[PDB]
Design an enzyme around this catalytic site. Structure first.
Site, short mmCIF file in Angstrom:
data_model
loop_
_atom_site.label_atom_id
_atom_site.label_comp_id
_atom_site.label_asym_id
_atom_site.label_seq_id
_atom_site.Cartn_x
_atom_site.Cartn_y
_atom_site.Cartn_z
N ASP A 32 0.60 -1.18 -0.07
CA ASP A 32 -0.26 0.01 -0.06
C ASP A 32 0.65 1.18 0.15
O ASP A 32 2.08 1.39 -0.52
CB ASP A 32 -0.89 0.06 1.18
CG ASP A 32 -2.25 0.66 1.12
OD1 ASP A 32 -2.51 1.62 0.99
OD2 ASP A 32 -3.21 -0.30 1.08
N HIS A 64 -3.75 5.89 3.92
CA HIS A 64 -4.34 4.64 3.51
C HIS A 64 -3.64 3.20 3.84
O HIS A 64 -4.38 2.57 4.43
CB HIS A 64 -4.33 4.42 1.99
CG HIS A 64 -5.57 3.56 1.17
ND1 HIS A 64 -5.06 2.48 0.50
CD2 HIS A 64 -6.54 3.48 1.25
CE1 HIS A 64 -5.86 1.77 0.11
NE2 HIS A 64 -7.17 2.39 0.51
N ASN A 155 -14.49 -0.42 -6.03
CA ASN A 155 -15.54 0.31 -5.59
C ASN A 155 -16.33 0.95 -6.95
O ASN A 155 -16.59 2.07 -6.89
CB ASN A 155 -14.98 1.49 -4.67
CG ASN A 155 -14.11 0.99 -3.65
OD1 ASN A 155 -14.41 0.02 -3.22
ND2 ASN A 155 -13.19 1.68 -3.09
N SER A 221 -11.33 -1.56 0.16
CA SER A 221 -9.78 -1.56 0.69
C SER A 221 -10.02 -1.65 2.14
O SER A 221 -8.93 -2.18 2.78
CB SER A 221 -9.57 -0.10 0.40
OG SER A 221 -9.45 0.33 -0.92
#
Ligand SMILES: [Ca+2]
Ligand SMILES: [Ca+2]
EC number: 3.4.21.62
Length: 275
Positions: A32, A64, A155, A221
């Site tokens: 990430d 994130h 998404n 996520s």
């Protein structure tokens, strides 16, 4: 004063924690934006950075990666949140920058590092509309090498009768994770398609943020790390299980929620999957 996020309870992880199964000795790579290793509720064991301009993997300029890591392994102490597998060795593989985007080469280089360093589980809360020969090869090589690869479905929502699952989640080797809310309903943003495998909590998920903070985010996520964490709990009980037996157990003990085009096999239940 430690809070257990609803999502950790929803997949039934606390049941395994009480039995002494907390993911100890399992190596999970959070590919990430990096993870803030200075967070009092996280313990990062190692990592590497593949972003040319951000050489420190333990510096998350986005937020994130730290949020995602906290869902996987926020420590079991008297502060902050609790992770799904709080004793897991967390590795920060920074492939996304401050803007939250990265180049495929960086991501693939990160998957490669993860294979070479014997990660048991890889979590990819990232994905795009397109794949590549090199992206498929990397995740296929990880699975052949015994690594459990989990990825966010996307998404993108529904679209006619089309699959909106992104890559690498779209590849058969990668477990694709969609999102559900507290009441087990699919989040309207969650991608759909025949490639969807399982569902995990993904709406208003509370976890760690850089700077000794905590915040709630929504997205697939946030769903993905619940499943990477589950995989680690199962391996701490059954370290002899292959990545294939870990995925079967996860997919085969789900709580059925609607059609698989929208919900995959359903909600994971790690208590039933761990046996
Ligand atoms: Ca904690
Ligand atoms: Ca897949």
């Amino acid at each position: 004063a430690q809070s257990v996020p609803y999502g950790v309870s929803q997949i039934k992880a606390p049941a395994l924690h009480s039995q002494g199964y907390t993911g100890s000795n399992v190596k999970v790579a959070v590919i990430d934006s990096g993870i803030d290793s200075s967070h009092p509720d996280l313990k990062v064991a190692g990592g590497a950075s593949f972003v040319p301009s951000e050489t420190n993997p333990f510096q998350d300029n986005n937020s994130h990666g730290t949020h995602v890591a906290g869902t996987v392994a926020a420590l079991d102490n008297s502060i902050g949140v609790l992770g799904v597998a709080p004793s897991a060795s967390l590795y920060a593989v920074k492939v996304l920058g401050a803007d939250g985007s990265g180049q495929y080469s960086w991501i693939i280089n990160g998957i490669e590092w993860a294979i070479a360093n014997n990660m048991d589980v890889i979590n990819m809360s990232l994905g795009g509309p397109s794949g590549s020969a090199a992206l498929k090869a990397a995740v296929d090589k990880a699975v052949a090498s015994g690594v459990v690869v989990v990825a966010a479905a996307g998404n993108e929502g529904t679209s006619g009768s089309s699959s909106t699952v992104g890559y690498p989640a779209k590849y058969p080797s990668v477990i694709a994770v969609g999102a559900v809310d507290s009441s087990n309903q699919r989040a309207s943003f969650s991608s759909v398609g025949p490639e969807l495998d399982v569902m995990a909590p993904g709406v208003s998920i509370c976890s760690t943020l850089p700077g000794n903070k905590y915040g709630a985010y929504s997205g697939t996520s946030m769903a993905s790390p619940h499943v990477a964490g589950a995989a680690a709990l199962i391996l701490s009980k059954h370290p002899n299980w292959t990545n294939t037996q870990v995925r079967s157990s996860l997919e085969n003990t789900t709580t059925y929620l609607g059609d698989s085009f929208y919900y995959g096999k359903g909600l994971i239940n790690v208590q039933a999957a761990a046996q």
